[PDB]
Amino acid sequence: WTATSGSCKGRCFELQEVGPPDCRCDNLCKSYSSCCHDFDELCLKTARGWECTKDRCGEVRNEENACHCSEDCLSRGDCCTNYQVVCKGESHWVDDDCEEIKVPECPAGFVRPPLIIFSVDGFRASYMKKGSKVMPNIEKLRSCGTHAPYMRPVYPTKTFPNLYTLATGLYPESHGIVGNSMYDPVFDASFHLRGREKFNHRWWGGQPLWITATKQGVRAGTFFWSVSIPHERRILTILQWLSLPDNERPSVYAFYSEQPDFSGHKYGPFGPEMTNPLREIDKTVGQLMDGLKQLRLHRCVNVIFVGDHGMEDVTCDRTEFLSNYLTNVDDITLVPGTLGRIRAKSINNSKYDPKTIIAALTCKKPDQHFKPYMKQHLPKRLHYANNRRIEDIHLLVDRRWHVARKPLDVYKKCFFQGDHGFDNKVNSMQTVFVGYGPTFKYRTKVPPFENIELYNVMCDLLGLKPAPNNGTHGSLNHLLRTNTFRPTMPDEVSRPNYPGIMYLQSEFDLGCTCDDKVENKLEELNKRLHTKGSTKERHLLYGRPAVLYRTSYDILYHTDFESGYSEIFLMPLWTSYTISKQAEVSSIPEHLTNCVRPDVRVSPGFSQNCLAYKNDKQMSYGFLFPPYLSSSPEAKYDAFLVTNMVPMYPAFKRVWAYFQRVLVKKYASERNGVNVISGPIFDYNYDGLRDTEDEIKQYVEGSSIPVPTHYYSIITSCLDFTQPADKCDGPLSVSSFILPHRPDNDESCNSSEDESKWVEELMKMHTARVRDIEHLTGLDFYRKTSRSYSEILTLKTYLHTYESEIGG
Numbered sequence: 001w002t003a004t005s006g007s008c009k010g011r012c013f014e015l016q017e018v019g020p021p022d023c024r025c026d027n028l029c030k031s032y033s034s035c036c037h038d039f040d041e042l043c044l045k046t047a048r049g050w051e052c053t054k055d056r057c058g059e060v061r062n063e064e065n066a067c068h069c070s071e072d073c074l075s076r077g078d079c080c081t082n083y084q085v086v087c088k089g090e091s092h093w094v095d096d097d098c099e100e101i102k103v104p105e106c107p108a109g110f111v112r113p114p115l116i117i118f119s120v121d122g123f124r125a126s127y128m129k130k131g132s133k134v135m136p137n138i139e140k141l142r143s144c145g146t147h148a149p150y151m152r153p154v155y156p157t158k159t160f161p162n163l164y165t166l167a168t169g170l171y172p173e174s175h176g177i178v179g180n181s182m183y184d185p186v187f188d189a190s191f192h193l194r195g196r197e198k199f200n201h202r203w204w205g206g207q208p209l210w211i212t213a214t215k216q217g218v219r220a221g222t223f224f225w226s227v228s229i230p231h232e233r234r235i236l237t238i239l240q241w242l243s244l245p246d247n248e249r250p251s252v253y254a255f256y257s258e259q260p261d262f263s264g265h266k267y268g269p270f271g272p273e274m275t276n277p278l279r280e281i282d283k284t285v286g287q288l289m290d291g292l293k294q295l296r297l298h299r300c301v302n303v304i305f306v307g308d309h310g311m312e313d314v315t316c317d318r319t320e321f322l323s324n325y326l327t328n329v330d331d332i333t334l335v336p337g338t339l340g341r342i343r344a345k346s347i348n349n350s351k352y353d354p355k356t357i358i359a360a361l362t363c364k365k366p367d368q369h370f371k372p373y374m375k376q377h378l379p380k381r382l383h384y385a386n387n388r389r390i391e392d393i394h395l396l397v398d399r400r401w402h403v404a405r406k407p408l409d410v411y412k413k414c415f416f417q418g419d420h421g422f423d424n425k426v427n428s429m430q431t432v433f434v435g436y437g438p439t440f441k442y443r444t445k446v447p448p449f450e451n452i453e454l455y456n457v458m459c460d461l462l463g464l465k466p467a468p469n470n471g472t473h474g475s476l477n478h479l480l481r482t483n484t485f486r487p488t489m490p491d492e493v494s495r496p497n498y499p500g501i502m503y504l505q506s507e508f509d510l511g512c513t514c515d516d517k518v519e520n521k522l523e524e525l526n527k528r529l530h531t532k533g534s535t536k537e538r539h540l541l542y543g544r545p546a547v548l549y550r551t552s553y554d555i556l557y558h559t560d561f562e563s564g565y566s567e568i569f570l571m572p573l574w575t576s577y578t579i580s581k582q583a584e585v586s587s588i589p590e591h592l593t594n595c596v597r598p599d600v601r602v603s604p605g606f607s608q609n610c611l612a613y614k615n616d617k618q619m620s621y622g623f624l625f626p627p628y629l630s631s632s633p634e635a636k637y638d639a640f641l642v643t644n645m646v647p648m649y650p651a652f653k654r655v656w657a658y659f660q661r662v663l664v665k666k667y668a669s670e671r672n673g674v675n676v677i678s679g680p681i682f683d684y685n686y687d688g689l690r691d692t693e694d695e696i697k698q699y700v701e702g703s704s705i706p707v708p709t710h711y712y713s714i715i716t717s718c719l720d721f722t723q724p725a726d727k728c729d730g731p732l733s734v735s736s737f738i739l740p741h742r743p744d745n746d747e748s749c750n751s752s753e754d755e756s757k758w759v760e761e762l763m764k765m766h767t768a769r770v771r772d773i774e775h776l777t778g779l780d781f782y783r784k785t786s787r788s789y790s791e792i793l794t795l796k797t798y799l800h801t802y803e804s805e806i807g808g
């Protein structure tokens, strides 16, 4: 119940929300159907429109008007935004040449530059260039301030997951808004765009920017706006708040536009109807900047122009129907569209089996436009699994397509020409970032980055301590003139042992064999040096990775590679090696095909054994340092050490073998040498974080050899590829991957063909940031480079996306 009988007199767009049943006057009262009876009359005035005209200049104040052009309007803070232009001979902000803002120029009583976030729904990154001719204000922000060619959203590329990621710095799996539609089985409640369940605080996790601010004594405008409040009135309201007394005035504000998403859905991303909505958005930006100039704030406020996600061409006719795949379509519930999420329709159905559903959806039609996954098998870069609201079965839908349960869902539930929600590396889903103001840099372009990084920066801009989040604080310091955040490298927690030769061959009973009894004070002194680390500077280019948890491990040196060997997991945490542009690939000699050699630096009790692999009929093994890239026949024997062996399903060995034999050399050729760090990952609870030993769900049968869920590689080279990887003076270039260690290649529909037709495609789908690998392993990479730490944090958040150019 609401008692709408109260009044909004002097309360229009009040900042504190009053408790029911008292009637509300804040910018969300409409959405809750709780506004006081006079809200429209008093707070949503429209009389005479939004612009001053010559004949209103000096007019006598009439409080009925939407905005004012009377002499007293500046001190009241409620002039139309073009007042000084029309009535006082001033220029529009967009018509002034841009002048660097070297320091904040703020009026007396301003304790810090305010922050204004101007957020636009469905603003595809390519609009900045393709629409630049009709968006002069936005183009001025862009060219004069700091901009990215694009900003990466989170998956799914839907509105509320991305807006709330922007507000919290968290992946959707962590903040809880994992889609625009959701079912939470613990609450037994559904979240919908339409209705009142979505207002319940329980859905919304983490700590959003407006709460972080308020707890630290920084006041915030209310970020949300009821759809019916026109944009002009949103802007006037913000400008009025900025004229409040110092002690009452917020320091952070948000404007939100439903455009261009609204029209994009109807007309497609570049439908000719899309020009007008872009013009109108620009006009709104102009109104803000003009109003700021009027208040003498245009060289004081930091403005962020940011989108949530892009927009792709999608039509009714590009829909896949689960009824064409499944026999039992009515036993399932499907969350449909640009992603699919499937669960059982009834928890009382004992014949529901996810394995049979997945199989019926796997590679069934030649040009099938979606692919099914158990969520723990989704690309780890999506970070989309660790939440009870994310159904076990997920469908990744190809760009330009939909999935639905049955055809009647699509006509009796054509219309639409655009949609979004696809994989967040897709070019059409990318969105925008521009920062302008004293704290941002001047005429600076920065590389694309992920929207999860922005919360930290918005906190830096306001002097706030960020709540714990998924950004890497410092990775965006290069966007800022001042207020950078200067982190220290984390402390190493475990120091390595450096074992020498401590065991005789006969102490081992691993059931291994090797034909290596073939064999000089020359290269015997020399191989002793190699085992003591004499070539380590070549193969460990950026320092040893630091182990950031308590464990027991050994550094092992070799001619061609160096490793950190875990006595707990019985395998390397990491193996590091450098392959020059000139390196030659060789074979595994016939007599060494099944060679595995005891490592006399490591006890039998801390070694794998070959008998376990013989007896486990499902499991084989591979090597981290590839025998194919040995520097010489004699060095190749090091590659067959038991301490370089890792457990691999035969199906996976196909992928790994092709990576090691073909691709590494290819990358060394293309990049002028590469440094490779490879290793296992264990994430059985799919939380994105290194498993402890007691979370491991599978071992090589009969043994304590844990089975990885994933294998990673970090491949580093010189950004200036005229320098070799091992003699690089400047910035680095990286690409990484986290490959699922699966017992089949069902993920790859063409896997019966030659690896040259499918393996690389798989690896591109599983591209990763170095930072993702850090979470998954508890390792810290790049500790000893000649680069600044912030630059290195940027490198660690890099994602190599293998998408074509944005714009063609």
Ligand SMILES: *[C@@H]1O[C@H](CO)[C@@H](O[C@@H]2O[C@H](CO)[C@@H](O[C@@H]3O[C@H](CO[C@H]4O[C@H](CO)[C@@H](O)[C@H](O[C@H]5O[C@H](CO)[C@@H](O)[C@H](O)[C@@H]5O[C@H]5O[C@H](CO)[C@@H](O)[C@H](O)[C@@H]5O)[C@@H]4O)[C@@H](O)[C@H](O[C@H]4O[C@H](CO)[C@@H](O)[C@H](O)[C@@H]4O[C@H]4O[C@H](CO)[C@@H](O)[C@H](O)[C@@H]4O)[C@@H]3O)[C@H](O)[C@H]2NC(C)=O)[C@H](O)[C@H]1NC(C)=O
Pocket: 170, 171, 173, 174, 175, 176, 202, 203, 204, 205, 206, 383, 386, 387, 388, 468, 469, 470, 687, 688, 689, 775
């Ligand atoms: C991205 O960044 C985020 C944030 O930094 C990272 O997430 C953090 O990860 C930590 C490790 O997973 C985790 O720490 C745990 O906190 C538990 C208390 O959490 C509550 O309080 C906090 C603080 O305000 C709050 O933020 C939490 O919010 C979660 O849950 C609410 C609902 O209750 C949601 O609204 C919200 O969206 C959020 O959900 C998300 O996180 C939870 C996990 O907390 C997931 O389950 C959801 O799916 C969703 O992803 C909570 O309200 C604390 O209790 C934990 O302590 C246990 O584990 C420690 C380990 O040290 C152990 O020593 C203890 O004994 C204890 O175990 C006991 O409980 C077990 C389970 O019942 C039981 O098995 C044992 O036997 C014991 O009884 C733990 O310290 C932290 O909460 C989250 N924070 C957030 C905001 O998500 C995330 O890792 C980053 N991602 C990547 C890839 O890096």
Ligand SMILES: Cc1nnc(-c2cccc(C3=Nc4ccc(-c5ccccc5F)cc4NC(=O)C3)c2)o1
Pocket: 031, 117, 119, 163, 164, 166, 167, 168, 198, 199, 208, 209, 223, 224, 225, 226, 254, 255, 256, 306
């Ligand atoms: C509680 C609650 N339950 N439902 C609603 C509700 C109802 C109607 C609209 C909205 C909207 N919310 C957001 C969310 C995030 C940001 C944002 C943008 C950039 C950077 C940081 C940010 F936080 C701006 C927003 N403003 C809007 O107007 C859209 C929300 O609120």
Ligand SMILES: [Ca+2]
Pocket: 682, 683, 684, 685, 686, 687, 688, 689, 690, 691
């Ligand atoms: Ca884990």
Ligand SMILES: [Cl-]
Pocket: 029, 030, 033, 034, 035
């Ligand atoms: Cl109302």
Ligand code: NA
Pocket: 612, 613, 614, 615, 616, 617, 618, 619, 620
């Ligand atoms: Na085997």
Ligand code: NA
Pocket: 745, 746, 747, 748, 749, 750, 751, 752
């Ligand atoms: Na296959």
Ligand SMILES: [Zn+2]
Pocket: 122, 159, 261, 262, 265, 420
């Ligand atoms: Zn939309």
